[model samples]
Target chain A: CPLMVKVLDAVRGSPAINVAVHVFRKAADDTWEPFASGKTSESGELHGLTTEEEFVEGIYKVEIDTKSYWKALGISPFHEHAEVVFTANDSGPRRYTIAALLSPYSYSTMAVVTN
Target chain B: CPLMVKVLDAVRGSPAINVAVHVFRKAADDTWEPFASGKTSESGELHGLTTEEEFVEGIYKVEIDTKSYWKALGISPFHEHAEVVFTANDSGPRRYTIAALLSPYSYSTMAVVTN
Candidate 1:
């Protein structure tokens, strides 16, 4: 696998299940073109979003619908979305895991990468 | 008076110094309009990014130049930038603090909000 996403609810101290996540690649026109998408599973993980052969070098983004996620938990959130943006596989093939921590009025997106 | 930013270098276990940060408001047309910006101080903090009066309810984003930050410390990074996006003050007045944890190939941005 080339990419994965994990979400956690900081307030609840558990996995953030069912949060909608989407991935995109930057186009030549600088516009975002949809590439992949997923929702967090039981463990708050979205695995195998892309494969090595399919994941080319480029600027990429993972945007998660945070507002609805909080709302579904019967709480209000501040952010409409939580997104992580980066240039991937610049020098060679790399694996990436994007971990997001969420609060009603707060959220976090971090990257864990390895060659 | 309303918004602040704090950055930490997870690898070094210290504050992320001299990191450039910019804040923006979402425009009606979906473009991000610059609102406030700054660089982290020795303590890895950007203070007073906005005032309560100016931080009305709206969608906001904070984009930090993480690549440059790590590069300055003789490390290469995966992401060009680390950004956090969310809505603010929909119910009433509130205060915000964005705390970011960063590594060469990984980073995390989280929010701390209050009245």
Candidate 2:
């Protein structure tokens, strides 16, 4: 039971490879404390960001630094980063999943509570 | 000689009607101070958000609260708000413009310094 993250190229319906993702947990003082950072695999996934036992009921953010990634691929992105901020509750399912569908100009994210 | 703001519906190529917009100016303390708020007109514009004489060289943010706007129009928005952050310089043109093209699922913004 863990937090699963996935990234996909919405335009091509392909995996977004090597995309850098940064996770941040909001602190009590309204500050964002860095939690973790990693890159997407060939399948565009980096699962187990946090486990059920390690999950804390609070606000968190995941930011994809796609500016450089797209630049290296000769893409011109409208925005530098695509970010998602969500609140997790203890009453939800043990596992959670956040999936992002992105392109050079647009992106969408959805979070679901899973078993 | 002012900071003009415009909003358009990218999907339909029409004006984004009645979209509420909030403008924030970043303070020296790294806090955002509310500067202005307005609703888009029939032409999807709220011009002169700030005049040339009143413009300051610093960081600023424009947040479009499109959640309620789209809901009232019976459209589902992918995100609650679409935001743009930019910096202004004294060396740029006196008059500036920020134009936003939006849809229920996507949006794009551009800023231009004008004479």
Candidate 3:
């Protein structure tokens, strides 16, 4: 897999299960075109978003609906959505792991990149 | 003070020093009004962004310039910037600590809300 995501629930101190993730590639015209989407597994991770061949060099955006995730847990969150926008594979095709921490009022993300 | 920020550099595994941060409060017209701003200290932390009296209930946005931070290190980063947008002081004037982790390609944020 070229890209993956791992989401943690800071409020619960556990993996955020069943959270939805949407992947978008930036079009040349500066619009976001939906490329792929998935839900977190039991381990709070989603993999195989794209293969190396299809995941060419480009600007990518990853969006997670943090509001709905908290709502389903009977808690009120603050953010409309949580997203990461970045250019990918500029130098070479690499594997990326997006690790994010989520709270009712806040969310954080980090990336682990490897060759 | 009611708001603070902590930023870590994942690539260097240290505090992201001198990283610029901007705070915004959503106005009645849905425009972002400048509220408070600061830069990360040597410990990758910035405190006293706003006082309890001034940090009223409203929607807030925090933006960090990760690209500049990485550029100073002679590295190329992916994201244009990193940001967190959320509502604050809804139930009460609570203290907030925004903790962020950063890399050249990705950034993550988490919030600690205390009464």
Candidate 4:
């Protein structure tokens, strides 16, 4: 099986929101990079974009700008930041479904790639 | 450090999105429950609502109605469903931060609780 990771999100009321997507590959030097970046559209969605070409079959970490995201909320966040680490096998030209369900306090993701 | 889990979500343009949040403890009976539930607000935000009172210190699974969520999208979903299993500590009267960052394709979560 192959894998495709998609980023999922839902905006309930606000049509105008800004989100930054950062992809970090486990570098040979044991680090990550700002591989791909984009912002949500008027529909509260930012999709079909990734720096996956820079990724391979291995474990990697994806970090979201929660602090800045919360700062935008103008609410005292219960969390200072957030991050997710998962393994990806880049064996084919497939789609990756990575979704983020967010509120003022919590967020989560699940990757639906070809297996 | 103690950990707090949060659910994060941003609905960009649509305020008509319906999401169901289910929290299940690793039942000795090997099952889950209806747990707590709520709907996102008009501002694309659902916060201060959870079934945390039913969870204890252990590994548990949280499943979302992605199928229904997608059905509502009226778009072909990239994935069928999504689930997140994590550990929690039954320590004190503390705050748990679990945020879900969602788009149409991907999602992610992080916990920030007092250790």
Candidate 5:
């Protein structure tokens, strides 16, 4: 399944423009191996991160680099990064999307499949 | 750490009052052992699902029984349940909370810790 991520700023209740995103596949040795990286667009979307890769069933992690982004905006964050881990299966026909609502002090992520 | 779960209705943008909730502790053999079951209060909250048990670090699953609740309210849900899985750590001073935002076809969950 193709994977897309949408990021939003919970504090401002708007899209988190230009925020960096890192995608990692958990290795057999319990380490995170970076697979793809990108930045959110002006509408706070990073679409098709997994379109090129063969969809595999395993644990995948998406890390939002909020530390530098928040710092640049003069905001103090409770945590440096907001990480979301999800298990994926390849049997679905629809694309997978993880919508992340983030703030300096808190973050929330939800996975949805859409056509 | 103690565990609390808060549930909200995304369609109405309000609390999912009196929704049923089920908690499962994933076992060593990859089977889900039922840990607790309850219903949401008027505020759509379930507090301290794990305060009585000694905190063990492992995967925990929470399933909101959305089917019955939605049907009772004359809603047709896209999915029967909204499930969330999280890895737990016992080394925190704060209590863990998983806030679930739910709609008929969409759901999102965020894990946070607060003192």
Candidate 6:
């Protein structure tokens, strides 16, 4: 079917967490392994990687620092941890521009994108 | 096996399209049917439904009114459309709080969340 949900741009606010982004590929036993990694910019932008984000054709998951990203700024967050688990069926390379904009209190990431 | 990228909180900015949200479910031949729907509040927040967003255990897609949302204003969009495709493995009820913060040129959506 044709895609219905569209994410045009993802913007982080003034303050953001310094994060290391990791990509995971699912294994035979229904698990995952590291596929690639990157970091968020100080201004909260991830440049030049949107067209080359790594994704595999199977089950995958993502995790971000929720407790520490907030605790570092002395803010107690409602969420102690955050994660997104998804399955991708495409066997294409460098198609997802997945990213996260995070602060001490909250964070959000875009899923693998399609035109 | 564990999630590496997590969306702690997803915040749509003050400026958001008056969007009526829709949830889709997969049929036997992998087609979609509307299961539920809602609208974003004026504050650009999808409050109160974080625990009740409907999703099925198959391929799911979300579509935002990109062209109309932007063309309603005076900004030209880099993308005329935005979509996200993901699969759910969990059978539990209301486990994902997917959302998007969109503007004329760009928009972004977080995947179904987990602990």
> Candidate 1 residues A43-104, lDDT tens each?
99999788878898889988998889888878877677877888876566577888888877
The reply for model 4, stretches above 4 Å from the true place, is: A1-16, A51-55, A91-93, B1-115
Ranking of all candidate structures by their lDDT, best first: 3, 1, 5, 2, 4, 6
Against the true structure, candidate 6 reaches a TM-score of: 0.40
The candidate that wins on TM-score is 1
Candidate 4 C-alpha lDDT tens digits along B28-68:
67565554456555544456554445455555555555556
Estimate the overall C-alpha local distance difference test score of candidate 6. 0.48
DockQ metric, candidate 5:
0.11
**Better model by TM-score: candidate 1 vs candidate 6:** 1
TM-score of chain B of 4: 0.63
Candidate 6: tens digits of C-alpha lDDT, residues B1-115: 2111111112222335365555555677788866544555554344443233343357665555556555666656667556656676675433444556565555555543433
Query: How big is the positional error of residue A38 in model 3, measured in Å on the Cα after superposition?
Result: 4.3
Model 2 misplaced regions, further than 4 Å: B1-20, B24-36, B39-115
Question: How displaced is residue A50 in candidate 3, in Å?
Answer: 5.7
Better of 4 and 6 by DockQ: 4
What is each predicted model's overall lDDT from 0 to 1?
Answer: 0.85, 0.73, 0.86, 0.51, 0.75, 0.48
- Angstrom error of the Cα, residue B37, model 4: value is 33
DockQ of each: 0.58, 0.16, 0.41, 0.13, 0.11, 0.03
lDDT of 5 by residue, B1-115 (tens): 3778898988887899898889888798988899888888989999756663555766677788877888898975545466665556635545677777876655666667665
lDDT of 5 at A69: 76
Arrange candidates by TM-score, highest first: which order?
1, 3, 2, 5, 4, 6
**In terms of TM-score, which candidate is stronger, 4 or 5?**
5
Return the TM-score for each candidate structure.
Answer: 0.86, 0.63, 0.71, 0.44, 0.53, 0.40
- Candidate 5 residue A29 Cα shift, in angstroms, is 2.0
Stretch of 10 with least lDDT, candidate 2 chain A? A104-113
Contacts from the true interface found in each model, as a fraction, amount to 0.76, 0.00, 0.60, 0.25, 0.09, 0.00
Query: How much is B99 displaced in model 1, in angstroms?
Result: 2.0
Residues forming the 10-long window of minimal summed lDDT in candidate 1 chain A:
A104-113
Q: Is candidate 3 or candidate 6 better by DockQ?
A: 3
